[PDB]
Each structure stands twice: as structure tokens, then as C-alpha cells.
Scaffold this active site. Sequence first.
Site, PDB file in Angstrom:
ATOM      1  N   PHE A  60       0.847  -1.190   0.000  1.00  0.00           N
ATOM      2  CA  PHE A  60       0.000   0.000   0.000  1.00  0.00           C
ATOM      3  C   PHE A  60       0.873   1.226   0.000  1.00  0.00           C
ATOM      4  O   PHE A  60       1.831   1.323   0.775  1.00  0.00           O
ATOM      5  CB  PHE A  60      -0.963  -0.018   1.203  1.00  0.00           C
ATOM      6  CG  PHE A  60      -2.041  -1.074   1.085  1.00  0.00           C
ATOM      7  CD1 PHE A  60      -1.739  -2.444   1.215  1.00  0.00           C
ATOM      8  CD2 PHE A  60      -3.367  -0.703   0.825  1.00  0.00           C
ATOM      9  CE1 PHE A  60      -2.735  -3.422   1.098  1.00  0.00           C
ATOM     10  CE2 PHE A  60      -4.365  -1.668   0.691  1.00  0.00           C
ATOM     11  CZ  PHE A  60      -4.056  -3.031   0.838  1.00  0.00           C
ATOM     12  N   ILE A  62      -0.110   4.995   0.070  1.00  0.00           N
ATOM     13  CA  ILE A  62      -1.227   5.937   0.176  1.00  0.00           C
ATOM     14  C   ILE A  62      -0.712   7.304   0.647  1.00  0.00           C
ATOM     15  O   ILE A  62       0.155   7.393   1.527  1.00  0.00           O
ATOM     16  CB  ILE A  62      -2.321   5.357   1.136  1.00  0.00           C
ATOM     17  CG1 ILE A  62      -2.944   4.077   0.552  1.00  0.00           C
ATOM     18  CG2 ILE A  62      -3.440   6.361   1.462  1.00  0.00           C
ATOM     19  CD1 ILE A  62      -3.621   4.232  -0.761  1.00  0.00           C
ATOM     20  N   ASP A 149       4.711  -3.906   4.304  1.00  0.00           N
ATOM     21  CA  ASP A 149       4.856  -2.430   4.349  1.00  0.00           C
ATOM     22  C   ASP A 149       5.662  -1.901   3.160  1.00  0.00           C
ATOM     23  O   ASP A 149       6.535  -2.614   2.616  1.00  0.00           O
ATOM     24  CB  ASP A 149       5.572  -1.988   5.630  1.00  0.00           C
ATOM     25  CG  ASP A 149       4.631  -1.885   6.837  1.00  0.00           C
ATOM     26  OD1 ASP A 149       3.515  -2.443   6.845  1.00  0.00           O
ATOM     27  OD2 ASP A 149       5.054  -1.231   7.804  1.00  0.00           O
ATOM     28  N   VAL A 150       5.394  -0.647   2.778  1.00  0.00           N
ATOM     29  CA  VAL A 150       6.116   0.000   1.643  1.00  0.00           C
ATOM     30  C   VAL A 150       7.376   0.772   2.080  1.00  0.00           C
ATOM     31  O   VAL A 150       8.271   1.052   1.252  1.00  0.00           O
ATOM     32  CB  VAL A 150       5.186   0.966   0.844  1.00  0.00           C
ATOM     33  CG1 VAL A 150       4.927   2.259   1.628  1.00  0.00           C
ATOM     34  CG2 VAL A 150       5.753   1.245  -0.554  1.00  0.00           C
ATOM     35  N   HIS A 171       8.795  -9.614  15.177  1.00  0.00           N
ATOM     36  CA  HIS A 171       9.001  -8.172  15.206  1.00  0.00           C
ATOM     37  C   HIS A 171      10.437  -7.928  15.712  1.00  0.00           C
ATOM     38  O   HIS A 171      10.836  -8.571  16.700  1.00  0.00           O
ATOM     39  CB  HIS A 171       8.024  -7.572  16.193  1.00  0.00           C
ATOM     40  CG  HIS A 171       7.954  -6.083  16.180  1.00  0.00           C
ATOM     41  ND1 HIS A 171       9.020  -5.276  16.527  1.00  0.00           N
ATOM     42  CD2 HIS A 171       6.916  -5.251  15.930  1.00  0.00           C
ATOM     43  CE1 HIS A 171       8.642  -4.011  16.485  1.00  0.00           C
ATOM     44  NE2 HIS A 171       7.371  -3.966  16.125  1.00  0.00           N
ATOM     45  N   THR A 183       3.706  -5.846  23.471  1.00  0.00           N
ATOM     46  CA  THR A 183       2.700  -4.771  23.409  1.00  0.00           C
ATOM     47  C   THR A 183       1.413  -5.256  22.726  1.00  0.00           C
ATOM     48  O   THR A 183       0.857  -4.588  21.845  1.00  0.00           O
ATOM     49  CB  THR A 183       3.238  -3.528  22.694  1.00  0.00           C
ATOM     50  OG1 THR A 183       3.668  -3.909  21.385  1.00  0.00           O
ATOM     51  CG2 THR A 183       4.419  -2.964  23.428  1.00  0.00           C
ATOM     52  N   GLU A 241      -1.821  -4.498  13.633  1.00  0.00           N
ATOM     53  CA  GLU A 241      -0.821  -5.410  14.230  1.00  0.00           C
ATOM     54  C   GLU A 241      -1.348  -6.157  15.459  1.00  0.00           C
ATOM     55  O   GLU A 241      -1.004  -7.331  15.684  1.00  0.00           O
ATOM     56  CB  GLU A 241       0.427  -4.629  14.590  1.00  0.00           C
ATOM     57  CG  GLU A 241       1.581  -5.494  15.109  1.00  0.00           C
ATOM     58  CD  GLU A 241       2.839  -4.671  15.180  1.00  0.00           C
ATOM     59  OE1 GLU A 241       3.074  -4.050  16.245  1.00  0.00           O
ATOM     60  OE2 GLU A 241       3.553  -4.610  14.143  1.00  0.00           O
TER      61      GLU A 241
END
Length: 292
Positions: A60, A62, A149-150, A171, A183, A241
Site C-alpha cells: 500500500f 497511500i 509495508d512499503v 518483530h 505490546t 498489528e
Amino acid sequence: FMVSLPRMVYPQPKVLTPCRKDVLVVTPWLAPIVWEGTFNIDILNEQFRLQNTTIGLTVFAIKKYVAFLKLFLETAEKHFMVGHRVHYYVFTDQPAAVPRVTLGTGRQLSVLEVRAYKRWQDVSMRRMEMISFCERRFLSEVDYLVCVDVDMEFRDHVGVEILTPLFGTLHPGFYGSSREAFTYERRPQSQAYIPKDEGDFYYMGAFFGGSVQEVQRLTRACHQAMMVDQANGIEAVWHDESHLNKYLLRHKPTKVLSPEYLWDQQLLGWPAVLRKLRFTAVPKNHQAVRNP
Ligand SMILES: O=c1ccn([C@@H]2O[C@H](COP(=O)(O)OP(=O)(O)O[C@H]3O[C@H](CO)[C@H](O)[C@H](O)[C@H]3O)[C@@H](O)[C@H]2O)c(=O)[nH]1
Ligand SMILES: [Mn+2]
């Protein structure tokens, strides 16, 4: 149907000689954790090429995030599934801002126009809805879907070793943490809620995938959970997430990618446990890039 592998000459795996002794290489539900030195890529390449495997990659870009596309795509060309059939699906509110990137043979790119949401959280969260039911060409066009992710670049091999019915990625911030420190969403009022005595790993929202079927299940489930939260006036602490983590807790991935596959060198350096940094964060000014 799977035909025979050809004769191949490679080093014999030795039962009494582990590949890696410094890290966990299999989960307790017997899913491989993919680290450098655990796989012979020549064997895997053969296996996946014999099936004529096609891999779809969603990304994505954007509003201001269109700026990350050039480096993302050009490095993907160097490192992602080279030799295999690849279909990129670029979701954007600015089709004309997608850079003209030269692709290797057997690789294609489709621009899918979508709406831009005002809040960066909503942009990140609506990826689940957009991937799912919305985009239907995946079942016909690809075998596996990879969703990333981009704001990233490829620096080293990312290949068929990742492919499996369902995968998540450790992560980079938390792979050494105990579960109480994760988290996760901790409010019982959220669909994403996970108690302090539950949890295998903390997976990052920036890299997951699997077969088209499993990816559609995951994205559908996460979207429906987010919808329930919205109706209840709650937004999970880490957005998509948090829901991804809830899903992967309750539906165990069949492979887990090591943080070689999602790293931030500026923030975390290059620890001894990482023999390769494969797919890495591009520095960003969060506030500036997320807002007009
Ligand atoms: O204006 C925007 C905001 C977000 N995005 C898309 O949403 C993705 C995720 O947003 P960020 O990269 O800003 O999120 P971070 O990497 O900072 O933080 C992490 O947390 C997010 C939730 O806050 C997501 O789960 C994400 O996958 C995860 O890596 C971006 O890569 C990009 O593909 C846009 O395209 N435009
Ligand atoms: Mn990101």
C-alpha cells in the site's frame, strides 16, 4: 501432483550437527523458524519451480507513502523471489505517482486504485479489508500472497523459503522479550485482547502471508474484528498489528520468519544472531510523512 526432483549434488545434512545452535529453529507446534543456514535454497527453488509457483506481493502506498515505491520495487526486483513468477499489486490513491520500474521476465505489476483515509491509523488498518471481501483476482492469479509495508527496502535474498500455508514475522523490537512485555492489546473490551499469560511471539504487521486461502481467512478475520471494535468504540493499541497477533495466537502459522526478514538497522544495529539483513526499514519522519 508433484514430479520427482532431479539428481542434485549438495552437502549432506548431518543429524548430529545442528545448522544453528544459537536460536530456536522450530516452534512448539513444529513450524520452521526461517533463519540463514537452516535451508538449502537450491532444493527449495527446485521444489517450487516444479510446481510453477506464482507469488503475489501486496503493498500500500497511500498519500505521502508513494515516495517509498521506487526503492521498494527496484530492490524487490533484485532480491524478492528472483527466478519465480511474481505479480505485484500496488494499492494507491495516486496511480500516476507510481514510478515506472523495469521488471525482470515473468514478473508483472498491477496498480489498484483505492481511497485514502485521513488518519494514518485508518490507512494502516484498512489494508485488511482491502486485501480481503474486496480483491478477488488473487485466487485466479497467484498461489501465495505476501503482504508487506512499503516504507522498506530489500537488501538480501527473500525467496521461496518463506512460502507455506500461513506465516508471520518476528518483530525486530521484541524477539528477545518475555510475553508479559509484548505490546499486545491488553483491554478485555477489544477483540484483539491477549492476557499476560498467553502468547507465543510478537509478530510485526509489516510482513505476513501464506496461500491465497489462508491470507484471505486472516485478512477477513482481522477486518471483522476491527469492525466489532469500532462498533464498540475501541481502537486497538497497535491497530492492524494487534489483531494480526490475536489471529496468529489462535491460528498458528506453519512457518515463522526470523527478524532477518523485518529489521531496522538505524534503530537496532546488526546483532550477531542476524547473518543477513534481508528486508529493512527506510528512515522516515513519522509525523511529517503521516500528515498533510
Ligand atoms: O499515510 C500512510 C500511512 C500508512 N501507509 C501504509 O501503511 C503501512 C504501515 O504504516 P507505517 O509503515 O507507518 O507503520 P510502522 O512500520 O511505523 O509500524 C507498524 O505498525 C503499524 C500499526 O501502527 C502497522 O501494523 C505496520 O505494518 C507495522 O510495521 C505503510 O508501510 C504503508 O504501506 C500508507 O501507505 N500511507
Ligand atoms: Mn512500516
